[PDB]
């Protein structure tokens, strides 16, 4: 109970359905494959973004470190220049003082010695006090001796 004509008709219908289905679904299979495979490019982009963020963080840290180093170097240079100028000024002032004050002290000592040497009235008063001091006192000398005054 098998009809070759009916068998041929059924085979033709099945073959036409299969060919049409293959032609229609060749595109859909590739579409689904691309939709699934987009995640691979997504992961590649995510890895690239992570690498870029890490590079940006490293660059920011390096910039902060370099800025801190330059700031410290500038502060150190300014402090060193200020200290050098201060030390030079202090040394110059100390030298000027030790020179001028000492020279003026020596000159004033010499002048005061000369004036006191000129101020022999106290030395004359000293000789007057020395007169009759337990000698030429109760028994005074014969008219004294002006030579000591002459010596003075």
């Amino acid at each position: 109970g098998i009809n070759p004509t009916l068998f041929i008709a059924q085979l033709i219908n099945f073959l036409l359905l299969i060919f049409i289905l293959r032609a229609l679904l060749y595109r859909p299979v590739m579409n689904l494959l691309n939709e699934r495979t987009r995640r691979i490019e997504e992961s590649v982009r995510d890895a690239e973004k992570v690498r870029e963020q890490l590079a940006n963080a490293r660059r920011d840290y390096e910039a902060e470190i370099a800025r801190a180093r330059q700031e410290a170097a500038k502060i150190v240079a300014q402090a060193q220049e200020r200290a050098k100028q201060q030390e030079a000024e202090i040394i110059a002032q100390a030298r000027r003082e030790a020179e001028r004050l000492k020279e003026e002290a020596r000159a004033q000592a010499e002048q005061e010695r000369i004036r006191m040497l000129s101020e022999a009235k106290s030395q004359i008063a000293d000789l007057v006090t020395l007169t009759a001091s337990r000698v030429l006192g109760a028994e005074l000398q014969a008219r004294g001796h002006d030579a000591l005054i002459a010596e003075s």
């Binding site: 004509t5 059924q10 060749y26 859909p28």
Partner: protein
Amino acid sequence: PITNSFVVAIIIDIFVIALAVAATRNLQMVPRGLQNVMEFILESLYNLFRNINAKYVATAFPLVATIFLFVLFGNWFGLLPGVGSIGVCHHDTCAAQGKKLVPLFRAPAADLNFTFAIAVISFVFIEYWGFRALGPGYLKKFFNTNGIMSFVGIIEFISELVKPFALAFRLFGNIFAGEVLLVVMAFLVPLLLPLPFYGFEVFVGFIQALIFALLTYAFLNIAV
């Protein structure tokens, strides 16, 4: 003209192109609707096709994948009850004044040619690939290869030739199994008896389509 079974050969065949057109229209990332769960099994079947061989996933996939996809609905098509409960006329509905009551509302896969149509398409394409890949090596006699070991090639080639014939027969028998089981509970009981295995048979028929797809993968596996 042709038989009602050959007449029924386009009821799902038209929908087969329509479903693939719908598959072409509905195929995207996270598709909800026509490509939500069926494509997941299809991808798993494609993974199963990938599990067979990477070449087998595309060597004769157009010659294989559509038929299994069609028979997947075709298995669901057979499970439909009431199709032919009244005679179509080419005291029952058509018992009086019998015009042979040829119901076109029947499974066309029940025709052995319809099973053989998918079977021959995959078998030949595998054989053509087998001719391309092995050819003589597919039926390599190997005369006295290991002290009269020529029987390996001859028996296997006959078995392989029998296998494509069996595969068409097995699908036809499986198709006939559902058609026979359709009236099994009909005269036995008037309600709800066939439900005990009709879905299971449809699942088996769905498995049979998968088995045919597996056989298509297996034939490619043998071709590999």
